[PDB]
Amino acid sequence: INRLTKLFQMVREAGGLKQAYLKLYRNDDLKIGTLVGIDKYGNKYFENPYYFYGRNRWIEFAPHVNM
Amino acid sequence: EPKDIVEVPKGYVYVNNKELSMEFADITDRAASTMFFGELLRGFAVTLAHIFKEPATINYPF
Amino acid sequence: ALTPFFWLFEEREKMMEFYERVSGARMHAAYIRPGGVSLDMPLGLMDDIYEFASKFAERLDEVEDVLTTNRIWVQRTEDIGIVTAEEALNYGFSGVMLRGSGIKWDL
Amino acid sequence: MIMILYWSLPMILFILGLFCFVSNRKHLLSMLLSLEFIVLMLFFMLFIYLNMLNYESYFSMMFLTFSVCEGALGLSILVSMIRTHGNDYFQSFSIM
Amino acid sequence: MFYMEFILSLIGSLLLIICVLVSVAFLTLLERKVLGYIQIRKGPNKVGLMGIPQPFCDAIKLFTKEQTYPLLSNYLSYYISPIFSLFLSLFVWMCMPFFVKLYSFNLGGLFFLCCTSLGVYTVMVAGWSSNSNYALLGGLRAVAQTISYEVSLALILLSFIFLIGSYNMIYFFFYQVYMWFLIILFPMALVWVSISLAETNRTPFDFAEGESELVSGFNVEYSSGGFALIFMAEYASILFMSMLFCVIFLGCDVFNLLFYMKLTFISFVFIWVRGTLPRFRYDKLMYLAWKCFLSFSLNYLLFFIGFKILLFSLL
Amino acid sequence: MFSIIFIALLILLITTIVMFLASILSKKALIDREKSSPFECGFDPKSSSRLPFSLRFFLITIIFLIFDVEIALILPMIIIMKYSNIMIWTITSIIFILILLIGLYHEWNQGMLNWSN
Amino acid sequence: QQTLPVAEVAQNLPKKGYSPFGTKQSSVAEWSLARLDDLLNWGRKGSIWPLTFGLACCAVEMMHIAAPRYDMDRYGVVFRASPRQADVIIVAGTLTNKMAPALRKVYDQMPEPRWVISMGSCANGGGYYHYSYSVVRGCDRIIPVDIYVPGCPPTAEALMYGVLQLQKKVKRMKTLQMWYRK
Amino acid sequence: RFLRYYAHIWRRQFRSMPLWHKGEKTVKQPVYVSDVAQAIINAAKDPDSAGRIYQAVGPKRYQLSELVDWFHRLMRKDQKRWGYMRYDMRWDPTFLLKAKLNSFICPGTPIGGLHPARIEREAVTDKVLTGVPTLEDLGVTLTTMEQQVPWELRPYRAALYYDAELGEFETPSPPKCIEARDELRLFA
Amino acid sequence: HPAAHGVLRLVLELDGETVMRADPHIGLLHRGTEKLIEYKTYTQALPYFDRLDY
Amino acid sequence: MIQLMLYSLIITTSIIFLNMIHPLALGLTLLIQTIFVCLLTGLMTKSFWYSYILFLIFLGGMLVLFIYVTSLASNEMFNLSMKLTLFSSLILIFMLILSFIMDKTSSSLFLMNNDMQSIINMNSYFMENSLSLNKLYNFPTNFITILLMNYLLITLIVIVKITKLFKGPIRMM
Ligand SMILES: COC1=C(OC)C(=O)C(C/C=C(\C)CC/C=C(\C)CC/C=C(\C)CC/C=C(\C)CC/C=C(\C)CC/C=C(/C)CC/C=C(\C)CC/C=C(\C)CCC=C(C)C)=C(C)C1=O
Ligand code: SF4
């Protein structure tokens, strides 16, 4: 009923539909989270208590890996 | 409620003990479900209800 | 039937977190030992054991609705494999097989 | 001739049906197989003749009803065959 | 002119053939997603983008995988049975009513009855040709299915036919213009779905496959090429039989868009049921068809013979 | 018809091409004496599949042949209701369906519909 | 052990690309085969069908991989019964001598290309019963093994990580590109 | 590519077997592969065997016509029922076309092992030189064809779906080797 | 067979589909557990029982 | 035109049918022919209603005899007859050649198709099978249908009495 407002937001931090699509194509999901930190190798760690326990904390792999 | 075929002692629970009533009020109730798939109907409501839940899958390895 | 397998193995997955949280292995805990268990429960486990139990009645009801009163389920089970009580005792039967046929026995 | 240009083919097919019904095959079922082969050809001719009439093809149903019953009865006798001889081979029957 | 007319008929069949062949690929995905959501799972979500290209990603494998040449099988029969299984699945679509004519098909309702019966031989021959114990049990488990549903199927079709006046499927549109026969025929709709499941050999009537009773039923001895066509031929049956439910009970507005929203929904119902009911017992089905359905169906022929007679007097 | 036959052949050709592609597109490896052995849960088979498979629904199997041939006589009903005498059509049709039901219930009560036991 | 690149060093590295063969093929024919070789691998990679072997108490954790928590099916992995349609075999449990001829046959009946996964210590090297008088000391004695998943039982994620290793192993096959050189 | 090259569908012509001269002027000494492998390893364990030539031949010599007859008896593909018959390959030119077509069409490997190079192998009769050591010098004990071949061809047998009763297929007669003197007469 | 749980070997005697005799061939999972225990200290033998009735 | 080719095929399949020995070989031959005869009959008629019925009726008989073939004659053998394949293929092409060079206005059957009827025939503008199947359910011929009913029901009593279900299953002992 109002998930589109969330959906548009995910695009904005994603960087437009072009970067949103590549995110969806890579992580298989679009999620809102706060950047907890960044490791030495570039992986970015996110957290959002909104989601349930297992999916609460997730990681973005470094861009250069790519698959 | 119907009666129990076997009286139950203390600290024991029976699974198939209640007998089947023979009043028309009940036979028709059993007949209606047996005749319009009534038992299976609620089975279909339950399964459809699970469509509207967040699935419990985790997006491994992320 | 397929769904009861998945609706229950979701709860089974939660339960084997308690095995994993006390013993360190999801299966084959090797926790009970002759002198008693090998470690104390972690602080705050029992709250999560309660949390699982408080919700487990609902999970079992939903499977019950789809299975217990199902007309097909009864036909696939009713009067299949009858074990008369006097037969069971002679056979070394035990557990539900013994109590399935009306014997009041539970160690 | 008219009979040769129009009715020869079904008749030649019919006699070939009979020659199946008499040839030496071990299993009784070989007779039943060839039985409804002939019936199939009888239908074909009967359907030629019924169509020379403008509206009389309804009798095809009458014929088909008797076709199945002789096949159905033919199959029942085979069942009774098995539960006295144990097998349906022709050579298993007393030659008389 | 006339020479041109039949060219269009070719195009329609080819267009309908490729479209049905494509849809059964995407139906299989839909089956996995929906059946993955009734179960609290997520379903195929990784391959390609959000899982949509999954069924194509499987069609690659089943064709780059070697044929199996069973040692004890009559190879020619074992090799051909997949062809006719798929052919009979596609061929029965030529009778699906179009107001933009594709094939006239007066007596189209019968043409359904002939074609669906043929689908049993392909299972039957494949099982016997494979020459494996399980395959043979699968085949003879499939034949016993026909002995059950076949007779009751015709009678139930006859009841619907009495309502419309002819065996031409087009008339279903005109009579379902104000309302839907689902209302008048609610128990038959419920019964008809039940028989429809037997036609396509689905849970709770999954005996030809017989998964977990026979290892894989009559498919147990098939592999890359043959098994694929057996699979596609299976889901083409679901898609058609789902459509045949939409033309009988749900309006039959083939040119409207909603008719295809309806068609997929009945396809969902077929998956929905597979995730609800356990399989019947091999004998309980045959008893069900003869003890209950056959007696049930005959009872309403009287009800509709009287109703048509009564209605005939008024009109 | 003649339109349908042509498309019937055209489809059969198309489906035939599909495996003829599969037979070539399929990976090819040397066939082993065990690869082509039958599948019977990994243990060699005791019994050929071509042994006599006993039958228990034989009686129903025969009754199936009959009941169909009465489907040949009910199907024409609708087509000839506008054109027939209503008494003759009504009477005959009913005593057609009553005969069928009576036959069915008679055997059902005699227990023939039950399988061999 | 080769350690991962640092961020700043990795901050320059080009994007990896999907194909493990790169787009550096000299000729058109080679390049087309390379791309065509990806199409095969993409196919086989996507839909890996285990056989539902499930011998011993690894088998239980082989059910929870299909459970909703981890959902093998998300990756295109679909359990199947007949070895003809099955593509991969997950030998999970203790392969005793009485079983050994049965596994060999079931594996043989599987059509190529077939990959084997060894689950748990029992199937890896005989595990806890390594010295028993009636245990085959590891399934690699009987059938070739393509991935070894250690554990006892392996965690559900551990097996999932194993399956993804098999996808990557499939992804880099050179079935066509090596025909050209042959 | 020897017991399969003669059991394959391509090699036949609907039931037949085009053999050069009907195979009656070809004499062969096939050796079981395991015996050859044993020879290679035994030669590897010994240094005395270095720098020498060894001939790996079976214990018996057979005419190519005699062998192929025996296979088709083992394979239950007898002429009486199955319809097996031997051409003379020189008479039918269709066969040579099949190989020439077969070689061209297939990119990876010829089907049924059939291609003109393989044909010439079949025609040439084995010429075991005198005085060159044989595997018996290496200690290998050669297996006869009668020992092994009847088990090689079990999965190629015809009408293998039958479930024959015991005795319904009679044991085939063994092949007749060719004596050394007979080879002189056979070759004039 | 999937229902057999990968261990059981029922050598059924099928008269059609009805079973006349069932021979549960067992031992496909015999791992001589009870002979290994005779060689192991009591503590070392505790894990063996996690495996029984797994 | 295909009518002649249908003549050739029905002849061809009949020649081989005389030479089948294996029951399933007979069945496959018969099943193929049931298609052609069904097709051919509808050519020379105002409708294909009877081809549908005939096809449906025989398919019922096709399944049942497989069930008994698979129980009685399960273990039997095939033999490809190179004499037969050449002979049928030889005549088949020979027959197909004639149908191309035939005066196929002469070979067509005189039975009046629906289109072969005149335009004035008022009775040809009704439903496809109205009149033809009509008097199957009108006085006096209706009683024949009624007579079948007892005949079919009385048959249904014959099979159970011949069969004697209670004394066991059927096996090829
Ligand atoms: C663990 O417990 C459990 C069990 O116990 C063992 C179970 O059994 C089960 C059992 C599960 C089930 C029965 C689920 C249902 C699934 C099955 C029965 C089988 C599995 C397979 C699927 C779901 C995949 C579906 C699709 C298929 C099998 C293939 C069908 C054929 C298809 C899709 C082809 C369609 C044809 C087309 C022309 C489409 C368009 C084009 C293509 C495909 C062409 C592809 C590519 C090319 C031509 C290349 C061209 C390239 C160039 C020109 C360069 C579960 C879930 C379980 O949890
Ligand atoms: S490896 Fe461990 S978990 Fe797996 S079967 Fe063996 S004892 Fe059980």
Numbering used by the authors:
A (entry chain q): 7 to 73
B (entry chain I): 32 to 93
C (entry chain D): 201 to 307
D (entry chain K): 1 to 96
E (entry chain H): 1 to 315
F (entry chain A): 1 to 117
G (entry chain B): 40 to 221
H (entry chain P): 229 to 416
Reproduce the article's own wording on this structure:
Here, we isolate complex I from Drosophila and determine its structure, revealing a 43-subunit assembly with high structural homology to its 45-subunit mammalian counterpart, including a hitherto unknown homologue to subunit NDUFA3. Cryo-EM particle classification identified three distinct states in our preparation of Drosophila complex I, which we refer to as Dm1, Dm2, and Dm3.
Our cryo-EM analyses revealed the major class of enzyme particle (Dm1) in the active resting state, with all the characteristics of the mammalian active state enzyme. The Dm1 class is the dominant class, containing ~60% of the particles, whereas the two minor classes, Dm2 and Dm3, each contain ~20%. In the Dm1 state of Drosophila complex I, these features are all unambiguously in the active state. First, ND6-TMH3 is clearly α-helical, it does not contain the π-bulge that is characteristic of the deactive state, and ND1-TMH4 is clearly in the ‘bent’ conformation of the active state (with Tyr149 pointing toward the E-channel), not the straight conformation of the deactive state (with Tyr149 pointing away from the E-channel). Importantly, as expected from the ordered states of the loop structures that form the ubiquinone-binding site, the site is sealed and closed from the matrix as in the mammalian active state, not open to the matrix as in the deactive state. Indeed, density for Q9 is observed within the site, although the Q9 is only partially inserted, with its ubiquinone-headgroup in the central section of the channel, rather than ligated to the two proton-donor ligands NDUFS2-His97 and NDUFS2-Tyr146 as required for its reduction. Contacts between the NDUFS4 N-terminal ‘tether’ and subunits NDUFA5 and NDUFA10 of 182 and 427 Å2, respectively, further stabilise the interface and, by extension, the relative disposition of the hydrophilic and membrane domains in the Drosophila Dm1 active state. In Dm1, the tail of a phosphatidylcholine molecule is intercalated into the structure, sterically obstructing the rotation of bulky residues on ND6-TMH3 around the helical axis to form the π-bulge.
